[PDB]
Structure 1
Amino acid sequence: KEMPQPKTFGELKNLPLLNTDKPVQALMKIADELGEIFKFEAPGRVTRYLSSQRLIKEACDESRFDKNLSQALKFVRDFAGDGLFTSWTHEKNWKKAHNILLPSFSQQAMKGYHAMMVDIAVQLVQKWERLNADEHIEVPEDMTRLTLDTIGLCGFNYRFNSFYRDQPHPFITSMVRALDEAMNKLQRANPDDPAYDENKRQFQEDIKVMNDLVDKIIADRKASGEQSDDLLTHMLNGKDPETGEPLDDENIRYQIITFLIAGHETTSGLLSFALYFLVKNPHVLQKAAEEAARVLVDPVPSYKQVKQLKYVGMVLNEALRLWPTAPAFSLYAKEDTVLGGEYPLEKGDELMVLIPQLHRDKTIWGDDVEEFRPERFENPSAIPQHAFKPFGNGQRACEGQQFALHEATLVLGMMLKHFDFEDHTNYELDIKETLTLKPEGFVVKAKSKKIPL
């Protein structure tokens, strides 16, 4: 079989189709037309975009395909280095960091981070409690303050103190601008044109800002010998079960940067989409709110209680089904192979899993894939294998998954315990794309239930 391909533009091939504010949504639109697989060419590059569970279940077979570093990840590596997210599976620092960080991100480790997550969650709730009657909430903006601060504290015991400022801490400003430059480079056919010399200067100084802050904290932590409940203490003390070495200081810095860039935006996007679907579906908001009130009975949520928020958990998964906030991941064929009995691949060929399309596969989910129905997830034993992949695949799946879900469940639970929410502008969904996806301009009003905190 021969595969479909969207509009080409001569020597730029398909590249101009993604010269847009919303390239992932462009790709979904193209998928809707072309089906489960289409070819997409840029100068010197070819990728095949997959949208059906039928084909993605094969792509997720690790004996046949491994994680690929996409152009985006290669660009992000200029500041994320050989951290877990931007490494090849067979790079020695991937294997070593994977072994060392595994118990730091396990469900048990969540008991240790819970107090610091609650610290920032309480800040977010207190902020909302202190709003005057005239005021509203900028939802993604606050969710991002919350996730950055949480990752800062659990990551390296550092307070960005985002709820104390109008202009973010300079580290955050530089990180956001480095990510932006990395995504922007995706569209640059002529990377080295003098027109970009200034982008380069700014990129290098942003990398410098990030490295100086993190390197300094690591160096001071080593000098002082101080110990804390953060990931930095784990990495300073952890010996690889295979090689018996700890991560060196430079890689520790990259893992810290990596937790921030891989975790802050995806998780805040998730909280934002979930709140959106809840105010667009009042029945569901009421069910979630009832559970939160029922379960979070203490002035401050315990680890055990968050684990009891089953329906909030379903709400989060159903938001991830519709708008998985890291919406695409890349794979390469380890050897020549034939995909789906129909599409021959050569060794090294690139595949891109388009998660939002997979999550809309009618042959899996049914007639009602656009509806927000948390009940799909009542019985996780019911979901076909490889049908639901918001956290990627296999040994290269999100290492942050337990952290992200525990933070999102705690926070969404506390929000629904403490406030009634009004969609006062009858907000029209508008999805901004950076490296990740989020609602843009999503605003609400929160009326306090006046429950002690």
Structure 2
Amino acid sequence: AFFIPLYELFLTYGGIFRLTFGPKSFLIVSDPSIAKHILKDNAKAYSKGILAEILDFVMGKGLIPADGEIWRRRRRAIVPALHQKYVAAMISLFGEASDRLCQKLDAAALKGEEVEMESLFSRLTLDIIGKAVFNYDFDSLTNDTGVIEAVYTVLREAEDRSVSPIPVWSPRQRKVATSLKLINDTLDDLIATCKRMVEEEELQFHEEYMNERDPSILHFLLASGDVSSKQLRDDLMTMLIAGHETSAAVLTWTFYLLTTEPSVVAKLQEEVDSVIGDRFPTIQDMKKLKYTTRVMNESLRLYPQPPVLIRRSIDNDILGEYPIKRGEDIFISVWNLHRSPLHWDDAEKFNPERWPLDGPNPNETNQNFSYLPFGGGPRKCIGDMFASFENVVAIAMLIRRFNFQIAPGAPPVKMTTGATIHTTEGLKLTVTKRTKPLDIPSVPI
């Protein structure tokens, strides 16, 4: 909840102030022009600062905590893997995995059982990202394994390291090392298997390269003639963490928000029934699911993942009107930017159509850095199309099949400090079926 007090301090003291706690301090930036200066116009004057001390233990030299030449080299190598053909193929994976979740919800609906949606969404996004990135099937939606428990142990340690530098106003360290070893060994097995597959395949590599039997990013990188084993594992681990935690929270907060506005749910149900019905969405459906897209856009506005971006000055600069030297630890409050009453009409209202339904999708450019769901400038998210489609698919397929409501007596929904916005106790919902089992599958065109 660290960003919550920063909001009211922003209202009183403005778009840049120094939050001091004893002999240390952070600069808190909530001004879109200043954010644009740091993230895009003058990014060369900034490092990821504290972000690296948080994530280094698991991401190593991966893209998110990296800076300098190793960042530039790996960025140029990895971005080509997320080409249009790859993203189009991942939409099939999104639908298959979302359908496996629907089967779980359908079983609960038939028994009248309530469901805790945050944990289910975490399993869904873990299953998707493991397959998309390095061709592994966690199947966390169905089972628990030592590999799955290792990932969540590592995730929890990353959460602990995120809260550690933040002011408030062994045996675990051995379990972490064991979990890291199991995941690294697991990745090593996949890398070895994939190299064998690359050596035996007959496919000329091109800019749209994709082996249809193994379309993972790991396979693209290996067939491209890419670096060391440590570096490749770090690259994969970074994308695993990034693509799991973010969308798990986006889906959680999207369905929380849906319970707050029945008229939005009605309009969403109308679109999904009309556009996809019971179908697995395709790439063509991504442009037609316009209201679903806006619901996702508005969820990311109200609950950004992460709610803050972290930088450190490595040179002199000017922020707003204020000169700074190198060494300033800076938190850009995406939360404040997204909820600023100066730049948003009825900023606290869940209103998917605050951007025209038939107009351009909102991004950091056309919102002039008052909206930054995927960051901006050279360090902008590389999975932004991937994740946007992933969440549209999950939302649409679930809303097609079920009605969701806050469960009676459910624990309150409150936020926590972390890399992403988790709830305190989950999102406990009742789930009822919208369609009949004996109805013929409906395929609209």
Larger RCO (alpha carbons 8 Å, 6+ apart):
2
Name the residue aligned to 1:145: 123
Following superposition, the deviation at residue 326 of structure 1 comes to 0.9
Name the residue aligned to 1:412: 395
Q: 2:414 aligned with 1:445, yes or no?
A: no
Change (3 A) 1:433 1:395: same
SS in 1 for 2:40: coil
Following superposition, the deviation at residue 330 of structure 1 comes to 1.6
- Measured against aligned partners, the alpha-carbon deviations of 1:138-157 in whole angstroms (never above 9, x if no partner) come to 11111111000000111111
SS in 2 for 1:38: strand
- Measured against aligned partners, the alpha-carbon deviations of 1:292-347 in whole angstroms (never above 9, x if no partner) come to 11110453322211331111111111111111021111223353222112x11113
Change (3 A) 1:139 1:188: closer
- Point out where structure 2 has 5 or more consecutive residues left out of the alignment: 201-210
Name the residue aligned to 2:36: 57
* Cα pair 2:277 2:400 within 8 Å, conserved: no
- Tell me which of 94, 99, 102 is aligned to 2:79: 102
Q: 1:152-171, aligned counterparts within 5 Å?
A: 152-165=130-143, 168-171=144-147
Name the residue aligned to 1:18: none
Change (3 A) 1:298 1:247: farther
Quick one: distance in 2 between partners of 1:123 and 1:222?
30
- Measured against aligned partners, the alpha-carbon deviations of 1:414-435 in whole angstroms (never above 9, x if no partner) come to 1111112222338643113432
* Cα pair 2:46 2:315 within 8 Å, conserved: no
Give the aligned residue type for 1:215.
Answer: D
SS in 2 for 1:392: coil
Q: 2:219 aligned with 1:233, yes or no?
A: yes
- Point out where structure 1 has 5 or more consecutive residues left out of the alignment: 1-21, 190-196, 240-245
Name the residue aligned to 1:340: 320
Q: 2:90 aligned with 1:113, yes or no?
A: yes
Give the aligned residue type for 1:313.
Answer: T
Q: 2:21 aligned with 1:37, yes or no?
A: no
* Cα pair 1:327 1:390 within 8 Å, conserved: no
SS in 2 for 1:207: helix
Q: 2:327 aligned with 1:354, yes or no?
A: no
Q: 2:154 aligned with 1:178, yes or no?
A: yes
Following superposition, the deviation at residue 106 of structure 1 comes to 3.9
SS in 2 for 1:395: helix
Quick one: distance in 1 between partners of 2:121 and 2:266?
21
Quick one: distance in 2 between partners of 1:285 and 1:298?
17
Following superposition, the deviation at residue 41 of structure 1 comes to 4.2
SS in 1 for 2:112: coil
* Cα pair 1:181 1:203 within 8 Å, conserved: yes
Equivalent residue pairs, number: 413
> TM-score, normalising length from structure 2?
0.86
* Cα pair 2:50 2:329 within 8 Å, conserved: no
Could you say what the CA RMSD is over the residues aligned between the two structures, in angstroms? 2.4
Moved more, 405-414 or 23-32: 23-32
SS in 1 for 2:432: strand
Q: 2:352 aligned with 1:374, yes or no?
A: yes
Quick one: distance in 2 between partners of 1:116 and 1:396?
27
- Measured against aligned partners, the alpha-carbon deviations of 1:28-65 in whole angstroms (never above 9, x if no partner) come to 35434443222234677542011122432332333355
Name the residue aligned to 2:257: 277
Moved more, 251-260 or 145-154: 251-260
Give the aligned residue type for 2:157.
Answer: E
Give the aligned residue type for 1:386.
Answer: F
* Cα pair 1:236 1:247 within 8 Å, conserved: no
Name the residue aligned to 1:24: 3
Give the aligned residue type for 2:420.
Answer: T
Give the aligned residue type for 1:390.
Answer: P
Quick one: distance in 1 between partners of 2:62 and 2:279?
38
SS in 1 for 2:343: helix
SS in 2 for 1:388: coil
Quick one: distance in 2 between partners of 1:133 and 1:144?
23
